[PDB]
Amino acid sequence: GDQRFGDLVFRQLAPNVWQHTSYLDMPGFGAVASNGLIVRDGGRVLVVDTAWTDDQTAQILNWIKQEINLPVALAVVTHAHQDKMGGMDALHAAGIATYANALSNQLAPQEGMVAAQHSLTFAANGWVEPATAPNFGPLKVFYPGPGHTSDNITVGIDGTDIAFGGCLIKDSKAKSLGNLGDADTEHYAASARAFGAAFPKASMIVMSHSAPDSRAAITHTARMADKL
Ligand SMILES: NS(=O)(=O)c1nccc(-c2ccc(CO)cc2)c1-c1nn[nH]n1
Ligand SMILES: [Zn+2]
Numbered sequence: 423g424d425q426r427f428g429d430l431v432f433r434q435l436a437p438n439v440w441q442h443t444s445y446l447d448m449p450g451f452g453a454v455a456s457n458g459l460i461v462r463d464g465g466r467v468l469v470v471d472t473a474w475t476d477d478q479t480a481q482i483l484n485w486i487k488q489e490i491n492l493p494v495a496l497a498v499v500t501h502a503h504q505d506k507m508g509g510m511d512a513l514h515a516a517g518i519a520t521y522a523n524a525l526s527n528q529l530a531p532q533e534g535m536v537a538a539q540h541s542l543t544f545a546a547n548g549w550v551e552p553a554t555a556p557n558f559g560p561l562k563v564f565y566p567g568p569g570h571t572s573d574n575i576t577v578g579i580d581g582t583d584i585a586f587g588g589c590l591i592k593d594s595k596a597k598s599l600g601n602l603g604d605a606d607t608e609h610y611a612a613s614a615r616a617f618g619a620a621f622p623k624a625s626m627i628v629m630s631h632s633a634p635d636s637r638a639a640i641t642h643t644a645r646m647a648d649k650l
Pocket of ligand 1: 454503504505570589590598599600601602630631
């Protein structure tokens with residue numbers, strides 16, 4: 423079943439993949455859960471997204487040391503908002519190499535985030551320029567276009583049925599696209615479909631604010647966005 427370490431919750435999704443879940447109480451909304459991933463790649467671990475805070479991100483790392491007991495080689499963060507990048511200082515203090523879209527790093531000061539140590543860039547078709555994402559193992563990084571934010575990125579896990587849509591994708595039973603304050607309403611639908619087309623074989627779609635879902639999450643998000 424699910425495991426807890428401090429304020430964090432961990433769910434095993436596949437033999438080498440776990441989902442990390444952290445919570446932040448928002449003054450007039452209550453607790454909001456955010457999800458990221460932990461991937462075991464041979465003798466090392468790869469992390470996708472921080473928790474909301476530095477303390478919560480340190481809890482992820484200590485759970486990894488306790489449960490997997492393999493070095494964390496790198497972390498990829500999916501856009502410059504608190505749920506995804508709020509724990510950058512904890513990753514840096516633990517000596518983990520950090521990667522984010524160049525645009526996330528450029529927006530990070532205005533967004534109140536700490537930039538990653540390295541910038542990822544992308545081809546016109548959305549795929550990460552390989553020279554900018556060295557030794558990423560099974561992590562396949564894809565920029566689907568502007569949607570939840572202009573800098574949002576996605577990641578597939580090679581050798582699994584998993585693709586991570588971060589905050590771009592909502593579950594198949596979602597009634598709204600969430601916070602559209604920094605969103606591109608014109609391009610959102612095409613970006614949601616581009617994520618789906620980049621990872622055609624992925625049958626488990628992991629996202630930031632809902633539990634893992636089928637490909638139905640991709641099409642239902644795109645239909646909601648078509649109405650924007
Ligand atoms: N990453 S963020 O800074 O923009 C953010 N911060 C806090 C809370 C939410 C949030 C999550 C779910 C819902 C349910 O409809 C509403 C808001 C988000 C959000 N919205 N969409 N993706 N994430
Ligand atoms: Zn966001």
